[PDB]
Amino acid sequence: MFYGTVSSPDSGVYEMKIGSIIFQVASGDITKEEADVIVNSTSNSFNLKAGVSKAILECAGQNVERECSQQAQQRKNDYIITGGGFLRCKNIIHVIGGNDVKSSVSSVLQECEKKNYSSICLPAIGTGNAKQHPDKVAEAIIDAIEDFVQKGSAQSVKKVKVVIFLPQVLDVFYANMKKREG
Ligand SMILES: Cc1nc2ccccn2c1C(=O)NCC(C)C
Ligand SMILES: [Cl-]
Ligand SMILES: [Cl-]
């Protein structure tokens, strides 16, 4: 109903259409990416500095760290939105790695439509300190995008890219894409 064909447009990058959205996966360092939104996978305190979250907060800088801890004290949040600091993005959306990954990605997509943003980059949310299993994470991320497209919600969002630090986790995402292809 929604899925195109898996191909490789550039070395180490694999992509397929999901409705009107280009879905891409690659291995590498997420802090080197440019997108309207970059997603951080953190703790329920929004102050984790381990693995991908260490790289994101160190490269974003101390003003972003401070914005996180100010919002965390204000109310109980499922996720928080900050500026991008010294990352190449307009906003960082910090999601809780231990939460339901489908729910987290659905929230990211909705917030990007509210801002008329076109591009998103995320890590393999929950596979670091939260220790969620990589094929459950892949299934949940791609399911969230399919649901968003099925509801007719994709308008401004055009590109969703997962940049994955371990090549072995990239292999799991690729297999999940191939299972779905038209
Ligand atoms: C070493 C490292 N550099 C980067 C840069 C980008 C994202 C994460 N990392 C890591 C990371 O995830 N370390 C945990 C483990 C594999 C040692
Ligand atoms: Cl995590
Ligand atoms: Cl990752």
PDB file of C-alpha atoms and ligand atoms in Angstrom:
ATOM      1  CA  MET A   1       0.000   0.000   0.000  1.00  0.00           C
ATOM      2  CA  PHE A   2       2.872   2.475   0.875  1.00  0.00           C
ATOM      3  CA  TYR A   3       6.383   0.945   0.288  1.00  0.00           C
ATOM      4  CA  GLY A   4       8.737   1.533  -2.650  1.00  0.00           C
ATOM      5  CA  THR A   5      11.996  -0.266  -3.485  1.00  0.00           C
ATOM      6  CA  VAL A   6      15.240  -0.493  -1.410  1.00  0.00           C
ATOM      7  CA  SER A   7      18.339   0.949  -3.236  1.00  0.00           C
ATOM      8  CA  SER A   8      21.698   2.602  -2.443  1.00  0.00           C
ATOM      9  CA  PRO A   9      22.094   6.228  -3.730  1.00  0.00           C
ATOM     10  CA  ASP A  10      25.525   6.804  -2.170  1.00  0.00           C
ATOM     11  CA  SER A  11      28.229   4.705  -0.542  1.00  0.00           C
ATOM     12  CA  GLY A  12      26.915   3.292   2.777  1.00  0.00           C
ATOM     13  CA  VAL A  13      23.409   4.811   2.381  1.00  0.00           C
ATOM     14  CA  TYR A  14      20.211   2.688   1.769  1.00  0.00           C
ATOM     15  CA  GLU A  15      16.795   4.198   1.031  1.00  0.00           C
ATOM     16  CA  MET A  16      13.161   3.465   0.170  1.00  0.00           C
ATOM     17  CA  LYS A  17       9.978   5.505  -0.270  1.00  0.00           C
ATOM     18  CA  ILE A  18       7.215   5.232   2.389  1.00  0.00           C
ATOM     19  CA  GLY A  19       4.340   7.120   0.751  1.00  0.00           C
ATOM     20  CA  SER A  20       5.784  10.543  -0.163  1.00  0.00           C
ATOM     21  CA  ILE A  21       8.655  10.350   2.431  1.00  0.00           C
ATOM     22  CA  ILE A  22      12.225   9.226   1.566  1.00  0.00           C
ATOM     23  CA  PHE A  23      13.385   6.882   4.425  1.00  0.00           C
ATOM     24  CA  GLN A  24      17.181   6.427   4.625  1.00  0.00           C
ATOM     25  CA  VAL A  25      19.634   4.487   6.853  1.00  0.00           C
ATOM     26  CA  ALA A  26      23.477   4.744   7.170  1.00  0.00           C
ATOM     27  CA  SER A  27      26.214   4.090   9.756  1.00  0.00           C
ATOM     28  CA  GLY A  28      28.302   6.961  11.152  1.00  0.00           C
ATOM     29  CA  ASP A  29      28.514   9.836  13.614  1.00  0.00           C
ATOM     30  CA  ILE A  30      25.101  11.602  13.952  1.00  0.00           C
ATOM     31  CA  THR A  31      26.778  14.819  15.237  1.00  0.00           C
ATOM     32  CA  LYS A  32      28.196  15.437  11.729  1.00  0.00           C
ATOM     33  CA  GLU A  33      24.719  15.460  10.073  1.00  0.00           C
ATOM     34  CA  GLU A  34      22.692  18.475   8.846  1.00  0.00           C
ATOM     35  CA  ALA A  35      18.836  18.344   9.200  1.00  0.00           C
ATOM     36  CA  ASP A  36      15.989  20.571  10.437  1.00  0.00           C
ATOM     37  CA  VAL A  37      15.691  18.310  13.548  1.00  0.00           C
ATOM     38  CA  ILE A  38      18.247  15.950  15.162  1.00  0.00           C
ATOM     39  CA  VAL A  39      16.892  13.498  17.748  1.00  0.00           C
ATOM     40  CA  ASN A  40      18.715  12.654  21.015  1.00  0.00           C
ATOM     41  CA  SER A  41      18.005   9.331  22.871  1.00  0.00           C
ATOM     42  CA  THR A  42      18.381  10.185  26.598  1.00  0.00           C
ATOM     43  CA  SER A  43      17.136   9.298  30.122  1.00  0.00           C
ATOM     44  CA  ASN A  44      13.918  10.356  31.892  1.00  0.00           C
ATOM     45  CA  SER A  45      16.059  13.113  33.545  1.00  0.00           C
ATOM     46  CA  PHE A  46      17.224  14.553  30.151  1.00  0.00           C
ATOM     47  CA  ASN A  47      20.845  14.683  31.451  1.00  0.00           C
ATOM     48  CA  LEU A  48      22.356  11.307  30.176  1.00  0.00           C
ATOM     49  CA  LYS A  49      25.918  11.744  28.761  1.00  0.00           C
ATOM     50  CA  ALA A  50      26.755   8.189  27.603  1.00  0.00           C
ATOM     51  CA  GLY A  51      27.225   6.837  24.039  1.00  0.00           C
ATOM     52  CA  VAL A  52      25.275   8.787  21.409  1.00  0.00           C
ATOM     53  CA  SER A  53      23.904  11.214  24.106  1.00  0.00           C
ATOM     54  CA  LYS A  54      27.484  12.047  25.214  1.00  0.00           C
ATOM     55  CA  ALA A  55      28.408  12.918  21.615  1.00  0.00           C
ATOM     56  CA  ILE A  56      25.237  15.007  21.085  1.00  0.00           C
ATOM     57  CA  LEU A  57      25.516  17.077  24.331  1.00  0.00           C
ATOM     58  CA  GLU A  58      29.289  17.665  24.012  1.00  0.00           C
ATOM     59  CA  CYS A  59      28.983  18.842  20.376  1.00  0.00           C
ATOM     60  CA  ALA A  60      25.734  20.869  20.972  1.00  0.00           C
ATOM     61  CA  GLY A  61      27.345  22.683  23.932  1.00  0.00           C
ATOM     62  CA  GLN A  62      26.632  23.915  27.410  1.00  0.00           C
ATOM     63  CA  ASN A  63      23.692  26.217  26.493  1.00  0.00           C
ATOM     64  CA  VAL A  64      21.711  23.149  25.219  1.00  0.00           C
ATOM     65  CA  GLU A  65      22.639  21.162  28.396  1.00  0.00           C
ATOM     66  CA  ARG A  66      21.282  24.040  30.496  1.00  0.00           C
ATOM     67  CA  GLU A  67      18.020  24.348  28.438  1.00  0.00           C
ATOM     68  CA  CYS A  68      17.397  20.592  29.016  1.00  0.00           C
ATOM     69  CA  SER A  69      17.751  20.702  32.798  1.00  0.00           C
ATOM     70  CA  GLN A  70      15.585  23.896  33.032  1.00  0.00           C
ATOM     71  CA  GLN A  71      12.663  22.304  31.166  1.00  0.00           C
ATOM     72  CA  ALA A  72      13.026  19.005  33.095  1.00  0.00           C
ATOM     73  CA  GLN A  73      12.458  20.848  36.421  1.00  0.00           C
ATOM     74  CA  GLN A  74       9.433  22.836  35.092  1.00  0.00           C
ATOM     75  CA  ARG A  75       7.097  19.857  34.454  1.00  0.00           C
ATOM     76  CA  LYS A  76       6.950  16.097  33.782  1.00  0.00           C
ATOM     77  CA  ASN A  77       7.919  15.722  30.072  1.00  0.00           C
ATOM     78  CA  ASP A  78       7.717  12.682  27.738  1.00  0.00           C
ATOM     79  CA  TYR A  79      10.197  14.621  25.469  1.00  0.00           C
ATOM     80  CA  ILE A  80      11.652  18.128  25.263  1.00  0.00           C
ATOM     81  CA  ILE A  81      12.532  20.483  22.379  1.00  0.00           C
ATOM     82  CA  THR A  82      15.669  22.730  22.564  1.00  0.00           C
ATOM     83  CA  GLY A  83      17.712  24.793  20.153  1.00  0.00           C
ATOM     84  CA  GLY A  84      20.398  23.062  18.132  1.00  0.00           C
ATOM     85  CA  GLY A  85      23.435  24.737  19.787  1.00  0.00           C
ATOM     86  CA  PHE A  86      26.564  24.012  17.733  1.00  0.00           C
ATOM     87  CA  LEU A  87      24.957  21.091  15.862  1.00  0.00           C
ATOM     88  CA  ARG A  88      23.836  21.660  12.224  1.00  0.00           C
ATOM     89  CA  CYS A  89      20.094  21.732  12.952  1.00  0.00           C
ATOM     90  CA  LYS A  90      17.276  24.136  13.915  1.00  0.00           C
ATOM     91  CA  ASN A  91      16.080  22.115  16.943  1.00  0.00           C
ATOM     92  CA  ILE A  92      17.058  19.010  18.937  1.00  0.00           C
ATOM     93  CA  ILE A  93      14.172  16.816  20.131  1.00  0.00           C
ATOM     94  CA  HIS A  94      15.310  14.805  23.217  1.00  0.00           C
ATOM     95  CA  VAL A  95      13.268  11.571  23.627  1.00  0.00           C
ATOM     96  CA  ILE A  96      13.466   8.992  26.468  1.00  0.00           C
ATOM     97  CA  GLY A  97      15.314   5.877  25.255  1.00  0.00           C
ATOM     98  CA  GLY A  98      13.370   3.514  27.518  1.00  0.00           C
ATOM     99  CA  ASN A  99       9.934   4.707  26.266  1.00  0.00           C
ATOM    100  CA  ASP A 100       7.872   3.078  23.493  1.00  0.00           C
ATOM    101  CA  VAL A 101       9.864   3.886  20.343  1.00  0.00           C
ATOM    102  CA  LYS A 102       6.820   4.039  18.027  1.00  0.00           C
ATOM    103  CA  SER A 103       5.234   6.665  20.316  1.00  0.00           C
ATOM    104  CA  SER A 104       8.493   8.699  20.450  1.00  0.00           C
ATOM    105  CA  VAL A 105       8.887   8.757  16.637  1.00  0.00           C
ATOM    106  CA  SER A 106       5.184   9.655  16.154  1.00  0.00           C
ATOM    107  CA  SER A 107       5.720  12.682  18.489  1.00  0.00           C
ATOM    108  CA  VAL A 108       8.872  13.777  16.542  1.00  0.00           C
ATOM    109  CA  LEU A 109       6.961  13.621  13.208  1.00  0.00           C
ATOM    110  CA  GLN A 110       4.044  15.685  14.577  1.00  0.00           C
ATOM    111  CA  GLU A 111       6.367  18.370  16.051  1.00  0.00           C
ATOM    112  CA  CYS A 112       8.169  18.655  12.700  1.00  0.00           C
ATOM    113  CA  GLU A 113       4.844  19.212  10.821  1.00  0.00           C
ATOM    114  CA  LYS A 114       3.935  21.934  13.381  1.00  0.00           C
ATOM    115  CA  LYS A 115       7.207  23.781  12.431  1.00  0.00           C
ATOM    116  CA  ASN A 116       6.856  23.138   8.625  1.00  0.00           C
ATOM    117  CA  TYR A 117      10.183  21.209   8.716  1.00  0.00           C
ATOM    118  CA  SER A 118      11.282  18.903   5.864  1.00  0.00           C
ATOM    119  CA  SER A 119      14.179  16.799   7.229  1.00  0.00           C
ATOM    120  CA  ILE A 120      14.793  14.652  10.358  1.00  0.00           C
ATOM    121  CA  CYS A 121      17.860  12.662  11.493  1.00  0.00           C
ATOM    122  CA  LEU A 122      17.605  10.151  14.395  1.00  0.00           C
ATOM    123  CA  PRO A 123      19.756   7.466  16.033  1.00  0.00           C
ATOM    124  CA  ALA A 124      18.621   3.821  16.684  1.00  0.00           C
ATOM    125  CA  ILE A 125      16.571   5.131  19.645  1.00  0.00           C
ATOM    126  CA  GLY A 126      16.720   2.908  22.771  1.00  0.00           C
ATOM    127  CA  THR A 127      19.559   0.592  21.665  1.00  0.00           C
ATOM    128  CA  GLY A 128      22.198   2.278  23.913  1.00  0.00           C
ATOM    129  CA  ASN A 129      21.793   2.670  27.712  1.00  0.00           C
ATOM    130  CA  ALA A 130      18.107   1.596  27.554  1.00  0.00           C
ATOM    131  CA  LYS A 131      19.114  -1.790  26.064  1.00  0.00           C
ATOM    132  CA  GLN A 132      16.052  -2.282  23.793  1.00  0.00           C
ATOM    133  CA  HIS A 133      16.584  -4.984  21.149  1.00  0.00           C
ATOM    134  CA  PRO A 134      17.619  -3.639  17.669  1.00  0.00           C
ATOM    135  CA  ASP A 135      14.993  -5.475  15.487  1.00  0.00           C
ATOM    136  CA  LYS A 136      12.154  -4.345  17.832  1.00  0.00           C
ATOM    137  CA  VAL A 137      13.523  -0.758  17.528  1.00  0.00           C
ATOM    138  CA  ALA A 138      13.746  -0.982  13.700  1.00  0.00           C
ATOM    139  CA  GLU A 139      10.191  -2.390  13.467  1.00  0.00           C
ATOM    140  CA  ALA A 140       8.856   0.450  15.706  1.00  0.00           C
ATOM    141  CA  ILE A 141      10.597   3.334  13.857  1.00  0.00           C
ATOM    142  CA  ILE A 142       9.386   2.161  10.417  1.00  0.00           C
ATOM    143  CA  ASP A 143       5.837   1.383  11.772  1.00  0.00           C
ATOM    144  CA  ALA A 144       5.577   5.002  13.112  1.00  0.00           C
ATOM    145  CA  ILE A 145       6.394   6.417   9.672  1.00  0.00           C
ATOM    146  CA  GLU A 146       3.866   4.075   7.939  1.00  0.00           C
ATOM    147  CA  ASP A 147       1.107   5.115  10.419  1.00  0.00           C
ATOM    148  CA  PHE A 148       1.884   8.859   9.864  1.00  0.00           C
ATOM    149  CA  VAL A 149       1.639   8.374   6.057  1.00  0.00           C
ATOM    150  CA  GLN A 150      -1.574   6.205   6.297  1.00  0.00           C
ATOM    151  CA  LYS A 151      -3.328   9.007   8.287  1.00  0.00           C
ATOM    152  CA  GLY A 152      -2.461  11.558   5.535  1.00  0.00           C
ATOM    153  CA  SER A 153      -0.305  13.593   7.925  1.00  0.00           C
ATOM    154  CA  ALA A 154       2.851  13.972   5.765  1.00  0.00           C
ATOM    155  CA  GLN A 155       2.804  17.485   4.265  1.00  0.00           C
ATOM    156  CA  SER A 156       6.062  19.316   5.051  1.00  0.00           C
ATOM    157  CA  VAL A 157       8.126  16.219   6.141  1.00  0.00           C
ATOM    158  CA  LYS A 158      10.021  14.788   3.110  1.00  0.00           C
ATOM    159  CA  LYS A 159      13.139  12.974   4.453  1.00  0.00           C
ATOM    160  CA  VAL A 160      13.712  10.812   7.550  1.00  0.00           C
ATOM    161  CA  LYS A 161      17.266   9.431   8.024  1.00  0.00           C
ATOM    162  CA  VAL A 162      18.522   7.017  10.745  1.00  0.00           C
ATOM    163  CA  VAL A 163      22.294   7.436  11.364  1.00  0.00           C
ATOM    164  CA  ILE A 164      23.387   4.358  13.350  1.00  0.00           C
ATOM    165  CA  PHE A 165      26.726   4.192  15.251  1.00  0.00           C
ATOM    166  CA  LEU A 166      27.249   0.366  14.974  1.00  0.00           C
ATOM    167  CA  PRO A 167      27.376  -1.222  11.471  1.00  0.00           C
ATOM    168  CA  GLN A 168      25.840  -4.433  12.933  1.00  0.00           C
ATOM    169  CA  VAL A 169      22.660  -2.469  13.851  1.00  0.00           C
ATOM    170  CA  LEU A 170      22.544  -1.014  10.298  1.00  0.00           C
ATOM    171  CA  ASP A 171      22.352  -4.624   8.980  1.00  0.00           C
ATOM    172  CA  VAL A 172      19.185  -5.194  11.134  1.00  0.00           C
ATOM    173  CA  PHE A 173      17.517  -1.996   9.735  1.00  0.00           C
ATOM    174  CA  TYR A 174      18.358  -2.985   6.133  1.00  0.00           C
ATOM    175  CA  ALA A 175      16.744  -6.443   6.585  1.00  0.00           C
ATOM    176  CA  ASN A 176      13.565  -4.839   8.033  1.00  0.00           C
ATOM    177  CA  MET A 177      13.310  -2.473   5.008  1.00  0.00           C
ATOM    178  CA  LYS A 178      13.700  -5.465   2.568  1.00  0.00           C
ATOM    179  CA  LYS A 179      10.882  -7.373   4.381  1.00  0.00           C
ATOM    180  CA  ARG A 180       8.501  -4.415   3.582  1.00  0.00           C
ATOM    181  CA  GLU A 181       9.486  -3.456   0.032  1.00  0.00           C
ATOM    182  CA  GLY A 182       6.935  -3.456  -2.774  1.00  0.00           C
TER     183      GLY A 182
HETATM  184  C1  LIG B   1      33.182   6.043  20.647  1.00  0.00           C
HETATM  185  C2  LIG B   1      31.987   6.793  20.156  1.00  0.00           C
HETATM  186  N1  LIG B   1      32.101   7.872  19.313  1.00  0.00           N
HETATM  187  C3  LIG B   1      30.848   8.288  18.971  1.00  0.00           C
HETATM  188  C4  LIG B   1      30.422   9.302  18.107  1.00  0.00           C
HETATM  189  C5  LIG B   1      29.087   9.386  17.826  1.00  0.00           C
HETATM  190  C6  LIG B   1      28.163   8.639  18.559  1.00  0.00           C
HETATM  191  C7  LIG B   1      28.581   7.761  19.502  1.00  0.00           C
HETATM  192  N2  LIG B   1      29.930   7.518  19.663  1.00  0.00           N
HETATM  193  C8  LIG B   1      30.642   6.573  20.406  1.00  0.00           C
HETATM  194  C9  LIG B   1      29.971   5.544  21.253  1.00  0.00           C
HETATM  195  O1  LIG B   1      28.810   5.228  20.995  1.00  0.00           O
HETATM  196  N3  LIG B   1      30.653   4.984  22.264  1.00  0.00           N
HETATM  197  C10 LIG B   1      30.180   3.837  23.031  1.00  0.00           C
HETATM  198  C11 LIG B   1      30.918   2.544  22.730  1.00  0.00           C
HETATM  199  C12 LIG B   1      30.734   2.131  21.294  1.00  0.00           C
HETATM  200  C13 LIG B   1      32.388   2.633  23.092  1.00  0.00           C
HETATM  201 CL    CL B   2      19.230   4.662  24.534  1.00  0.00          CL
HETATM  202 CL    CL B   3      22.664   4.515  17.233  1.00  0.00          CL
END
